[model samples]
Target: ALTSNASGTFDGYYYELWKDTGNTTMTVYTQGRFSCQWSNINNALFRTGKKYNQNWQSLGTIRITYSATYNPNGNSYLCIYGWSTNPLVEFYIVESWGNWRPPGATSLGQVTIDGGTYDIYRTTRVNQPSIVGTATFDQYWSVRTSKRTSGTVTVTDHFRAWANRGLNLGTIDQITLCVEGYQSSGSANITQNTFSQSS
Candidate 1:
């Protein structure tokens, strides 16, 4: 859905992320660091090149999977961006879990976030027809918090530090670019952008 200069744009960082719509597995590819695939409903936003100018080094990933028919009627929101002005991030972790479950349907799985357990509503592994070349709904998770940061994550005292930076959820059936941050000098800046639901 993003159609701008993907690279060499200093006005704002040129990275790519994907959302799966239709039968096609939507893939948000980036020409910079490397090509990451967003397979399942578990669409993860990733970054490349951080830490001592390590080009394309994956910074972090996020996945938010929820139910199919839940109405957003409150200030329930989620945000992801650089914790500092590093143009990248120090540490990041997220899950692609959905809300709402069918009557008597088996629970998909469970994910522990900050010592709390949330039922995994949907499975991330999806088999869409259009997913090709680093495209698909990714749904595999391993407990690698330490592996992700490699024992250098003590920014906020608590191991977890990603806080939901308030968002008002209206009754609109679409995805909106809520908020973003670029650690470096104007590397990433997220604003209001409307997107058509891929039907």
Candidate 2:
């Protein structure tokens, strides 16, 4: 189970791969413009801001105001992900993979969402380490072709864009505004000022 808001609004938002074995874990610290740090570990985690269990057809738009400042030497991401009763779908706006590696990720195509263009990548993993449990699912990311470290963006547009391409976004198990880092031996931070989903 995850922790609760002890120091502030950002406490209960952490997931880690190997917390008992001294593996990498991220600590989120606020509901507005949060910050996280993981200096040297080959671990995967989510700094989720919100979690929900809903369907895609019941939504209109998901929006966020975000920013970040990180050491360019590590791999990090600003994105959202959730389950759709089958596979897991995700949207990544900023991906800094300077010193990290992915597992057989392949770029599918390009898509435009809310006036921003992105390169979409898809991959599948079986029995991957996670904080909640072992995960076996498909992962999709809509990474912006042009780098953006800070801005307001509409994420729902990406779902519509991908739906047009034959990908289905089913029920959403979770929606998060997060900054994920791997092998980050330097200073890094991500901030989310505002976030919401409207219908």
Candidate 3:
């Protein structure tokens, strides 16, 4: 249960829940299974994963295996969400979304990873709220062409593809598997989730 925002640890991994407005609730069925219901929300999110003080390269490859049930009345996302430093970046590797597909403009390019092709996009957020409080930062996006509720997210491959396109990330803040809702009402349940980082 989160009123507006909060973050902590579950199974020694970082977890966060936030909502812009009230009237949202989350149920913790287990460390691996959770459920969220939101109403009259402009922005809301729930994420769980590892946080490292060092860069991703230091962690080698990052991977996630997940399955979820998502239903939304407006906009929502099932994605790999994270941030990095030296360059101040926020990024997403979107697996599924509802009501709308995002980065809703033109994309930078595309890449095939983990047996799927993802369209890449780059955008800037100016003078907005960020990990460093109010500041400007760039965003990198990789939205899957084929949406699925269950699969493996090869996050390292997306980073490598971003690098090939001159979109460089920085040191880590955290990497999380996240569900986000915007201006929406929805319910989402994570039935299975597994994360790993290999050196």
Candidate 4:
């Protein structure tokens, strides 16, 4: 079904969720937009996107255009999320946030790209739950200095910036726009979303 909280391919994108509070609902529209609603959550995460297997350096420019409404009563993140294998990395290009900043990792400096200055951070997840079950992984982040609700994310620039800082990424696994809530209540709607790669 198009309404689910688990793994599925809908509207030409893959959708997945992990929730500890339950009752997380996600609906993917035929036009490639998706909406999710959840409340009283200890933790909830939902996303939909395209999967791939290739080196990001060789994949050309990856970009996303989106308009989103993200409301959270507590902590949340509206971000371009993705993963890679080999070295096992999780990455986030945070466009907006709720309540507080995330990862809070040691500053890896900053990069100005796509008309915004993003603070770079690198954190380690120690045997945490991940796409491959319990594992240790590195998370790279580019948190925007200012929050946004709609715009174009030139994703490749973030990757290149990370690479320049010695944060090399492995082969791509998947890329998705995601809404994640922690110990909070919230909902999000991506009214317009599109992903493109220049290859």
Among these predicted structures, which one has the highest TM-score?
4
TM-score of each: 0.24, 0.75, 0.94, 0.94
lDDT: the better of candidates 2 and 4:
4
CA error at residue 171 for candidate 4, angstroms: 0.9
lDDT of 3 by residue, 1-199 (tens): 6555777776666777877675777765555567788888878888777787787666688888889897777799988899999999999999999889887867989888989989999988999777788889999999999788888998888988998898998797888778889888888988877877787
Q: At residue 19, what lDDT does model 3 achieve? A: 70
lDDT (10s digit) by residue, model 4, range 82-139: 9998879999999998999877778898888888889998899898878898999999
Q: Write the per-residue lDDT of candidate 1 for residues 1-199, one digit (tens) a residue.
A: 3422122221233343433321111113232222222222222332322111222212122222221111122211122122222221222222111221111223444445544343322223334422132333422111222211111222121112222211111111111121111111111222211111111
Full-model lDDT for every candidate: 0.23, 0.55, 0.83, 0.85
Sequence-dependent TM-score of model 3: 0.94
Clashing pairs in 4: none
Where model 3 places Cα greater than 4 Å from the true spot, the runs are none
Candidate 2 per-residue lDDT, tens place, 1-199, comes to 2222222234444232222221343455455444454555554444455555677777778887766675545665555544555445544445344454332366668877656777766666688643246777666667776556677667677677667766677776655555565555444466554677788
Query: Could you give the C-alpha RMSD of every candidate to the true structure, in order shown?
Result: 16.2, 4.3, 1.5, 1.5
Model 2 earns a TM-score of 0.75
Worst 10 residues of 1 by lDDT: 178-187
Candidate 4 local Cα displacement, residue 16, angstroms: 1.2
